[PDB]
Amino acid sequence: MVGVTAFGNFDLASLAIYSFWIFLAGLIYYLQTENMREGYPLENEDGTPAANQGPFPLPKPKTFILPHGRGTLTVPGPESEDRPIALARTAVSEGFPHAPTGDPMKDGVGPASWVARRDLPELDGHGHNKIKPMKAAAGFHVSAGKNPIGLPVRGCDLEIAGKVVDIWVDIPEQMARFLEVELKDGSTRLLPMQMVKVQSNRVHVNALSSDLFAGIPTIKSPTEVTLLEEDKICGYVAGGLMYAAPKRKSVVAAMLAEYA
Amino acid sequence: MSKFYKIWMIFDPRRVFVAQGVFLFLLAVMIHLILLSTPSYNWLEISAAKYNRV
Amino acid sequence: MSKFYKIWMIFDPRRVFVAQGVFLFLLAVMIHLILLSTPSYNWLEISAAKYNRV
Amino acid sequence: MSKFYKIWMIFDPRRVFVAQGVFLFLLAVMIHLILLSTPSYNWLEISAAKYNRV
Amino acid sequence: MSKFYKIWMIFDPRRVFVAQGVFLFLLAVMIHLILLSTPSYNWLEISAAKYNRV
Amino acid sequence: MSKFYKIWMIFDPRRVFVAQGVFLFLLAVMIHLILLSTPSYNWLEISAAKYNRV
Amino acid sequence: MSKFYKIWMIFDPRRVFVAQGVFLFLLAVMIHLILLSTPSYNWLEISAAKYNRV
Amino acid sequence: FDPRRVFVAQGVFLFLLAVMIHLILLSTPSYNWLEISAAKYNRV
Amino acid sequence: DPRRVFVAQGVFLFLLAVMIHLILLSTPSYNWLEISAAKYNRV
Amino acid sequence: ALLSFERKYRVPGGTLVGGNLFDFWVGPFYVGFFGVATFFFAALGIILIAWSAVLQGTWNPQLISVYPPALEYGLGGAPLAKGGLWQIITICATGAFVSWALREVEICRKLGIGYHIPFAFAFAILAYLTLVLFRPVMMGAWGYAFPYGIWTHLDWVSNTGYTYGNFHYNPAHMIAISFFFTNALALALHGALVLSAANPEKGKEMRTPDHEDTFFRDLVGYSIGTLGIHRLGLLLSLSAVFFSALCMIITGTIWFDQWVDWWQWWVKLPWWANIPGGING
Amino acid sequence: DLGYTGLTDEQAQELHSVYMSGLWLFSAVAIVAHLAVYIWRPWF
Amino acid sequence: LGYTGLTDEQAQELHSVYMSGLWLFSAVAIVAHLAVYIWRPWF
Amino acid sequence: LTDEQAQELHSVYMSGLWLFSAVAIVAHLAVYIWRPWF
Amino acid sequence: EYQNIFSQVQVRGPADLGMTEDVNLANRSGVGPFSTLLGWFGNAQLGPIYLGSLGVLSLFSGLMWFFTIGIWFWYQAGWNPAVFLRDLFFFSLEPPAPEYGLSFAAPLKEGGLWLIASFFMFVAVWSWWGRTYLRAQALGMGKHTAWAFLSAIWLWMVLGFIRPILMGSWSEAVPYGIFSHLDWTNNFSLVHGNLFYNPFHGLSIAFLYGSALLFAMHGATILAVSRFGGERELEQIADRGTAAERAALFWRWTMGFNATMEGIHRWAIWMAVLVTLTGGIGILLSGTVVDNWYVWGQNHGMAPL
């Protein structure tokens, strides 16, 4: 079949390439349609629906049947965020920042934001709790690397705000998730591991300073952690990067601020 | 043939009409390009021959 | 042959009809291109020869 | 041969019928392409030869 | 040979029948392709040579 | 040799029989292909040269 | 040599027997192919030369 | 030392080393028992 | 860990011995088999 | 305008240069100082490619080609019509890519996330600079860089590869190709696994990460985990690009011959270099 | 009333009737064009 | 059988209208095939 | 499925199968008469 | 800054035997050892692996394929271990010569062994595909992995089975050997004109580059939002959190559009599948329809002349 044409130069090479162009257009449409299942419809900065919705229409809803009798999530659906946002718009026109009205970290807006998830712990496959302190877990032990239990915890201002008591691990996943860090208030806070730098003599936290360690949202029950409060803790620890920038003893930051 | 209308209790009109419009335009472009490719029925070249434009 | 209708208690009409439309269009395009490929049954070339176009 | 029907207490009809349709279409395309490949039984070239078209 | 039937207290019929169907079709295709590959027993060429189709 | 039967108190029959069937088919295909590869014992070519097929 | 049997308080019979079967088959195949590779001891060619098949 | 792992490693080692030695012998034109036997008994 | 050290040592010793024997077998001399064949008229 | 959830994140700050001069959005796009710069550079580059189309004489998008200066110009400038437009477009492209990376830093930073994304984009930027800047400068002329054409830079790839015979024998090349193939395999497996967990057999409950580990351990016997798979993906892609840059930086610079001649060294190693038989000897 | 799209019988008939009116208008324009081309230059 | 959701009467109605459409399609195909065959046979 | 359902479904299947087979036999005879392959 | 590239402290405890729905555990083996080296990057646990009927079929066929190629390599070195060591990358198990065509009459030594090894490889790969499908089915999961593997198998089948049949010669399949199959690739390109001017070759390259692109993008995004538990993706699909929102907003403010925790994986699977899909189509057209791609490109507005 080498080289006969149906018309002009059109052969199976050309038929295949044009068929692929059509198929690719259809596939791109389908992929974007699947990706329009969270966050839509679009809205103005004042909450009312926008005149924009886009060239791509919303897909038909599909239902996820949650495991462990948690119910059903059907998407796309009506999305509200079931919490008040403490922001005030800077300009009357659109596409401008909304400045925080009170304390930004702690009303939970910006990089310190959090989401109202279900106030329940996520479960492993067998139904138990997924994340658990070392003492509550049976058989787990620090297996390699510098064991952080018993070390002081230093903030971004080169003060020590507490010291490590226990590790929260993720049972099926077999990896450490939180540092239970206890202050000389006596109450304990949770530290995401990916926000802490475990050194030989010291657990450094670039995010926060000592005075902000007390503000971390504490845990409802003392052996478990729910999704809501994980957002709450993670959002505050992470928003500490911008909102605790002044209080930080960084050579390069002081360098640039003195020049600026 | 009388009750072909029940196809619309099977198919959502919006999706069907979008697909139909795309299909019809693509088919029309197909046939026009096929006609333009052949030395005859390439109406452009033919009118160039008839009125001695070249 | 009389109870072939129970195929619709096996298959969802929507999916079957979409697949059938795609299949029929693809088959028709197949056969038309096969006919266009051969020097005979390429109705374009044949009519151009018959009426002495080029 | 009388009680072959019990195959349907082994196999789900939906899956079997989908597989059978796919298999039958693929086999038919197989054989048609095999026939088209050989210089004889390529009915296209042959009719061209018989009626002195090209 | 009389009590070979006890193989069905060893093996689930569904899985065995699926595997057997796949095996039989694959073997048949094997042998047909082997026959088609050899210049003799490629019945296509034989039928082309016997009736002066070339 | 009398009490070889205790192998079945060691091995699960299902797994052993599946492995044995696979092994036997693979060995048979091995030997048939080896025979077909050699110019002699390739019974096909032998038959072709015996009846003067070419 | 009398108490070699205590190897079975070291090794699980199932795993050892599977490994042994695989090893023995692979070794037998090894040796047969080595014999087939050499012009002598390739019993096929030797029979072919004896009975003059070519 | 786990006796099972040691025994498996030892068996693999012994067999692999034997195969290597036999292959080294078969490589040389001499010591190739099959081929020198073929030369002896006029197999050419 | 004595186990890991011993395994690495055994692998090292065996591999090095094989390399040395191969180096010897490479040279036309020191190839005990081949010089023996030359000596005893194996050609 | 805004996603249902976007407004609580649109806050001031977290930007490297310019305070709140350009700390605003245009539609969904965040602008910033480096957004202004990258729009300028991208616009100018696309315009200059169109002007190349005008000068060359074609309007076929697949035939437009902007060739670098010829070899005799060395590392100096060339007339715009015969090599200078390529140089200006290269400067515009480099500026656009770097501004894009810095704008990504600003966005990562307003949102409070790590800088892995501008990190990984810097690897691609360095591979591009290896092909366009480092190797031709180390090697003497702008004429060793590739033209800006859809099908004419493939000609550059082919000619450069066949200058050294079969380029398949470059070893860093083989490592990079293995990384690319492994990356595509891992991407397919990861997408399939997550989709199959979220979209199970049809009407039964949504799966868990335990099911993903179970499936893959049944398949081959060692699951890597979610964090593991994302680490492995980032590292596979970055290693592929790094070894591409290496294999091309060493080519024509410290290696000048056929690459199978490089592979020749293992064959000639003392304890087998003389044995008869086999493929080699 | 399969309810797959949610439309009722009367809605279906109304929509199908207006569709078919549009379809026959399109078909009529196509037939006029085809006759014009055929008269101008036949393909049979 | 209980696999999609339709009853007997719905199945018969849908199948009847399908088959009417199928035979209409088949009739148009037969007319086209006869026209082509008369115009230029392939047998 | 039960016994009666199985028999009913198998009977209608086999009617369809023999219809398909009959059309295939007619086509095969037509082709064979037109041009034999044996 | 901690970059989350390597775990900085590890933990372990009881091994996880895995979920137990519709899975015959008689076939699942026992858990293997824990690797401290693998634990610095991902999971440290090895095993347990499932060993079924298709598992044994695939293991047997693949082992015999590998063994057959190895025995041919040993023969091809003259049974010398040193030559085998030095020419391991230069050995080749080459298909029959063109004059045999598709016939199985090639002697054992110019391609009977190639045919035997190819049969073993066929059985091994298709058994593994079936095993992928059944492992997905046993846990009640979707069959997405089976279809992506089917795309890879499509390219493999075109390279070794379908194209040789279309060209009527076993001589045009791929030899088993490292440098030999690389030379097969180069010579395939040389014989048919540039494959660079094969449009489906270009599409395949586009989707391979896109795979590397998209998967660097996605790994970097997930590692950047792993501070909010972003790596736990099934739960973010189930119950959206701030990691998902921050990822979506990063990509929306960067390039004007974003995805979902769910939908980025549809992008990923299609981006990876299209590589071998378009590659198989291009190789199938290569030689069967076009035998000089550069001339074809000249004829189709791709090359200057």
Ligand SMILES: CCCCCCCCCCCCCCCCCC(=O)OC[C@H](COP(=O)([O-])OCC(O)COP(=O)([O-])OC[C@@H](COC(=O)CCCCCCCCCCCCCCCCC)OC(=O)CCCCCCCCCCCCCCCCC)OC(=O)CCCCCCCCCCCCCCCCC
């Ligand atoms: C009407 C007018 C006429 C118009 C005509 C023109 C039409 C234009 C259309 C334009 C395109 C529109 C969009 C297309 C993409 C849509 C994707 C989609 O909708 O996903 C939904 C759906 C999502 O499933 P889900 O919701 O996640 O599952 C939830 C369930 O609970 C769990 O469900 P599950 O686990 O059971 O999953 C089942 C399902 C879900 O699959 C997945 O999970 C995703 C896997 C993605 C990879 C799939 C590719 C695998 C490739 C197989 C072999 C490749 C080589 C084939 C040969 C190449 C062609 C020559 O599996 C599949 O669908 C894949 C089957 C692959 C068989 C391919 C056989 C050969 C081709 C035959 C064509 C028909 C194919 C089937 C069509 C019907 C499907 C129901 O996924 C799919 O159905 C995949 C669609 C497959 C499309 C065809 C695949 C090959 C395409 C070839 C392109 C060639 C172009 C031409 C070039 C050469 C020409 C000469």
Ligand code: BCL
């Ligand atoms: C001089 C050489 C030629 C050329 C010749 C070819 C040829 C010939 C081909 C390609 C192909 C490809 N080339 Mg090219 N290529 C050239 C230049 C390039 C350049 C470049 C920058 O120069 C690039 C990026 C590429 C890139 C690509 C890929 C997009 C594509 C292969 C997809 C793939 O992953 O296959 C690898 C994946 C597979 C082969 C699938 C394997 C699947 C099976 C199931 C795996 C089984 C494993 C087996 C059992 C082993 C088990 C092991 C144990 C389990 C451990 N080529 C030049 C022009 N290239 C292919 C293609 O599709 O082209 C259209 C192809 O055939």
Ligand SMILES: CCCCCCCCCCCCCCCCCC(=O)OC[C@H](COP(=O)([O-])OCC[N+](C)(C)C)OC(=O)CCCCCCCCCCCCCCCCC
């Ligand atoms: C406030 C401070 C004020 C200080 C003022 C005093 C500074 C005095 C500076 C005088 C000369 C500076 C020399 C610069 C170093 C050049 C290296 C050199 O040795 O030159 C030899 C070569 C001579 O090339 P040649 O080919 O003619 O000769 C070969 C060189 N020999 C034989 C001598 C070994 O010149 C170059 O390398 C030219 C490089 C051009 C660099 C321009 C880059 C533009 C910026 C954007 C870069 C990013 C995009 C890259 C794209 C580039 C365009 C495509």
Ligand SMILES: COC(C)(C)C/C=C/C(C)=C/C=C/C(C)=C/C=C/C(C)=C/C=C/C=C(C)/C=C/C=C(\C)CC/C=C(\C)CCC=C(C)C
């Ligand atoms: C290369 O190979 C070559 C090309 C040479 C040879 C190729 C050969 C191949 C094998 C040819 C294959 C042919 C196939 C098998 C032919 C199949 C034909 C039939 C199955 C197609 C069916 C057509 C019927 C269509 C037109 C149906 C139309 C009906 C619609 C108008 C509406 C009806 C739909 C519903 C039921 C209506 C209302 C809905 C409810 C609510 C009542």
Ligand SMILES: COC(C)(C)C/C=C/C(C)=C/C=C/C(C)=C/C=C/C(C)=C/C=C/C=C(C)/C=C/C=C(\C)CC/C=C(\C)CCC=C(C)C
């Ligand atoms: C290269 O090799 C070559 C090509 C040369 C040779 C190849 C040879 C191969 C081996 C050929 C293989 C042939 C195969 C084995 C032939 C198989 C034929 C049979 C099995 C196909 C079956 C056909 C029957 C079909 C048409 C069924 C039709 C019935 C439908 C119309 C509806 C019936 C479905 C249900 C039961 C009806 C509803 C029932 C209710 C109660 C729900």
Ligand SMILES: COC(C)(C)C/C=C/C(C)=C/C=C/C(C)=C/C=C/C(C)=C/C=C\C=C(C)\C=C\C=C(/C)CC/C=C(\C)CCC=C(C)C
């Ligand atoms: C000392 O070590 C020992 C000897 C024990 C074992 C070591 C062995 C080592 C040396 C093995 C080396 C293996 C080589 C290096 C593997 C290379 C594989 C190459 C790279 C594969 C590349 C491409 C191969 C693919 C394309 C093959 C595709 C063929 C499939 C499509 C199946 C073909 C279907 C066949 C032709 C059907 C024939 C059916 C029967 C009737 C013959």
Ligand SMILES: [Fe+2]
């Ligand atoms: Fe992911």
